[PDB]
Write a protein that binds this DNA or RNA. Sequence first.
DNA 1: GAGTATTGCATAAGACAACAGTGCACGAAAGAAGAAGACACT
DNA 2: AATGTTGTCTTATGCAATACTC
DNA 3: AGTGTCTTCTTCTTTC
DNA 4: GAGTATTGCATAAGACAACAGTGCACGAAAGAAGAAGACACT
DNA 5: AATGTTGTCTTATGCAATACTC
DNA 6: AGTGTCTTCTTCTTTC
Lengths: 49, 49, 49, 49, 269, 269, 214, 213
Amino acid sequence: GPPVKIRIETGEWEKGWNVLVWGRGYAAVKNRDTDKVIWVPSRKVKPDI
Amino acid sequence: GPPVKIRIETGEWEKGWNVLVWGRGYAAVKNRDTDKVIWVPSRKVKPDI
Amino acid sequence: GPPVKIRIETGEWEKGWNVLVWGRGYAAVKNRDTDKVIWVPSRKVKPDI
Amino acid sequence: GPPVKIRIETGEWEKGWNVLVWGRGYAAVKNRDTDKVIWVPSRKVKPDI
Amino acid sequence: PLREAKDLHTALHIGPRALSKACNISMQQAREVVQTCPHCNSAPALEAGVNPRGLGPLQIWQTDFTLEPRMAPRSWLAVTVDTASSAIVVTQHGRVTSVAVQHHWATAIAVLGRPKAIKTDNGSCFTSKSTREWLARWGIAHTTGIPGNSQGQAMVERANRLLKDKIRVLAEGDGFMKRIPTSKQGELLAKAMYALNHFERGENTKTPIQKHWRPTVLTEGPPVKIRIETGEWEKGWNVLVWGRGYAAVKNRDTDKVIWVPSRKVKPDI
Amino acid sequence: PLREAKDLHTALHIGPRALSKACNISMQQAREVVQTCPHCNSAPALEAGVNPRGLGPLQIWQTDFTLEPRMAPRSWLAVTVDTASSAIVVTQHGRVTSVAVQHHWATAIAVLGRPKAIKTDNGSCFTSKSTREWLARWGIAHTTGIPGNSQGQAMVERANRLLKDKIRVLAEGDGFMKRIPTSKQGELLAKAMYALNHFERGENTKTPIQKHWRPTVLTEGPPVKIRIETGEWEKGWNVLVWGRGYAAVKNRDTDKVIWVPSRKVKPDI
Amino acid sequence: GPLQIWQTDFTLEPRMAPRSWLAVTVDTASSAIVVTQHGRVTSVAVQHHWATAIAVLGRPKAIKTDNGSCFTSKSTREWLARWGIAHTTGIPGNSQGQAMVERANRLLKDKIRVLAEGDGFMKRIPTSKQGELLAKAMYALNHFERGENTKTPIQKHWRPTVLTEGPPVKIRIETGEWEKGWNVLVWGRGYAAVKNRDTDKVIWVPSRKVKPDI
Amino acid sequence: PLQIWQTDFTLEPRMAPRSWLAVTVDTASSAIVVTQHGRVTSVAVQHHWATAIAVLGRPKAIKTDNGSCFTSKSTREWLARWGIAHTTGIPGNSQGQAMVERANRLLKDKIRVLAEGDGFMKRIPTSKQGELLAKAMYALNHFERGENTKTPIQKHWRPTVLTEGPPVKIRIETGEWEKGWNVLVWGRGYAAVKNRDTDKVIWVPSRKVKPDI
DNA sequence: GAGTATTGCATAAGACAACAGTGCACGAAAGAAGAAGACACT
DNA sequence: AATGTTGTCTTATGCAATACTC
DNA sequence: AGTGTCTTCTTCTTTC
DNA sequence: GAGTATTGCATAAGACAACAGTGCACGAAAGAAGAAGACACT
DNA sequence: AATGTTGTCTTATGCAATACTC
DNA sequence: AGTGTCTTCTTCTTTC
Ligand SMILES: [Zn+2]
Ligand SMILES: [Zn+2]
């Protein structure tokens, strides 16, 4: 999965996440090695590298 | 999806790349054999067929 | 200081007014003899004389 | 003079007082009862009515 | 002079115009050469997401809770909207509990008919099995939004602001700048109800009540092109509703209906 | 008709077009009848302004303090800017006390020339007694800003963000995710100062190390129309400088140069 | 229109829990009913019911006024005059007052007793299901037919319909002349899709190039 | 300028423990920069050089001394990273390097005089030394040394004041580009210009005017 | 009488806030006012 | 499971409709 | 014995 | 043989965002985990 | 006594360079 | 009467 970076409520960009499936404004995000697969709004994902 | 061509450092148009659901600005593309996904800017990639 | 030229119902071009406090949306009507607190829209008014 | 709805630190607009002297983008405002003159940037006042 | 410029950025991270002026290299070459450190390569995309909605007059509802300080001790207000022809229904309880929104919806249904789906917050009172069985027995589908985003219910998080403004004006238009006496709120909320949806709101030329009762729906639409993620605008689609944004597109080949921002729409021919 | 509308509004305050509808009233009459309820309407307010600057260098220095979390032993950074030719100088300290400020205003004067105004905020360190005598010994004027206001020192406030971003991207160049070792906490600010001084910034033409030593001063300006309180634009003024959002106009016959927003200026002929 | 005359009535049977002394109001044209609880027979607790009925139905013109209890106070009279509605205040029972509400009262009593018996509580109902029980009776009696007709009060009072064609539009842009009038469609940015009245052909005329005829 | 930079180390006890001081002077419009470092270290030498560069500019062909903590391969690599000619000349060595010792005594007498002026016969306290050292910088670099009419900072920076803009190519109503005009205030849209000799003013659209050669 | 200035209205075309369960709390430097032990007077 | 929005203001044009101007 | 300023301490206040 | 005809450039507008001494705090409804006491099979 | 601001990204537009074509 | 599940009675968790 393409590595992307996410946005927690304390305005800080976390790395170490990969996407699994997208939709029409929501995405499925999984941690690098501590998988807690969750959903996330579209406007919180930034591509890396 | 369909084959695509991108601009590598020794600029030219080559094959073996599949584009998934696209995205304005930066995109992702995968390999056929190595199945390796990368992020590439918009103007550097062109549909093959 | 310099008075204004305003509408209310028919035309009250007469003097006794000020532009000492001037705004883009209002003009702060204030009579040199009794003062006012209502303010007036600036678009529908004009300079005196 | 014409009063304002001067803003407070957290945020609101209340009928506080009027203005004594003007100039560039700062003004001096009075008080209705205790009568303490306060300097304030122009971008915080608001005309009444 | 290029070899120097390769290491100059690594050493300093100055900028493309400065590199061009200090090494006599073209701007295109400088821009090309300055991509090695993601630190200097922000590359922001941030995506975009918008507009979930329904179509039929009596198929999608939304509901939520608010707190009003000026209101009497029973200071909790439940408000609901129907996101096809915007209509507002509000009641007052004062204690957020499971039994509150089982009488709230009972009152709400009796003026609008039975809806077919509800999407609300994932809070406490909406999750109890007591309410789940009640919903199942009544026979209405139910779903919930993502745990944390407040923008999923914008269609009511915008309406409650207008409701608060109207109620505040009506309150302090009659010499009541404090807690309203307990003998007037019941009569005041009815007048607020009447004033909200019986006349045009803003600029649309139709009363919400009549829009709800006698709506308009059309079949087939004019040709239109949509700029799907494949760069350019495809064909084989028709627009059947389009307002201030949030366009809706129906398939022309076999069948589908989707909701897309009003940016990927051009009136073909 | 012009009847029943007054009490309709004063009982159920609504929109102008809605009031005009169902009463066959013109838009102008609707407007003049709605502009009577002081509870509604009366929206517009607010104005703007600019910060005075200096035509020549060494006139309007500004200073302030900050705090860098990754500067572990002594964060407490101090920064100064020129506001004529945009050059900056920084200093490191471990405790905000009114001996540190006096120490800081000893390298800035050594590096640059001698200023004439050091306008800053009204923090406890600056408005002391030991500082006033020290300042008067050299002979520099002093003034402060409005208490509580933060936009007065906009130049240094903006420069702080650039300084922090540069220091962070330079810190994470060789690999340092935590507090920098004290051995290398030395010759690291020098590189940042060199980069921010002896090179181009953004897209400008000249470095602010020559823009300081050899500035440009004009003697006359082309005719220009300037907005006044009234809609009329007065002509007969001469511009001196014109940046992104400011102008430095001057009278033809009284020489009363004043700074105004850049919106109220147009060329002549 | 089915808005000509309303009727109000005050009803006993405090077998229904405290907040007894119910108030009911029915329309004659479409036979729609609204009922509310009350604390006591007070003039001030009349305008509450009237405002609720107005907000739920519309603005009436003539209201059959019950005579004798509290519908004579100057306060209520001025409240009525404020909105400007015509009260009758005739002789109750024979031709006014209890002229049509008999069947409505009987039906509501039957409904409330049946719903009470269907879920238990032979004796006085617990004072925690008042509104949630009243709403079910409201919905049933106003949505699930009253007699043996296909004329349920909601349908006969609101006349529900479905529309497919919009308002007429004029295309007086060619040389200052328009056709007989065409049909407007989706009003997207820049243009305005228009279909012919007869040939039914879609044209993307510019938005500036269309006007509302008559 | 910035040709023969000279730096050197000198001990001084009338100070903080701080048993060393590093001085640097340019052999053209001589300007002095001194640090206040303690025990001799190559890291301190790098720090001093970085501070001197940041305060003056990027020099070339720097000579300091030979021996001591100056032959470190780490220092060699650090110097080569920027890229500077390095000379291993003998410290002092008379010749054209002696201005370091010439200015050392001047600095010593100046600092002792200014220290003894405000009390403190024997030794200055610790929290009184930064400003004391800073004042010497200004007193030595903003005034004529003892005989010249031009300060070292003037002779190093060549100050001047300008009042006219660069030449700018102007398009006229023939397709070609006219020559011999100067730019002025860059207004909104317009790019007002002046003649070189006839002293005219004229507002011109931006697309009708381009930078000159 | 054709070219011209003014308006006015009529659009229309963008921008523009505010809505989210409730709001505070703590550290530090410098100065200022008031009060208590104390050795004049007493 | 699970995706921003809309009532209020201003500023930007055209052309019919008076008001004129040699 | 009543005071009483001098000095020192003890709080309270204001900005960030 | 002149339209034309697109396409690849070289450039002007035109927004966008964060910068400010530092961040947490509590109330409430419903459910889940776990654990101690109590009467029946053992 | 005492006033917002610039470095980075984005999108809009005129002119040469190889068909072009009848 | 040990335990053993049933009863009950606590102590944490989530979301707003
Ligand atoms: Zn970089
Ligand atoms: Zn009003």
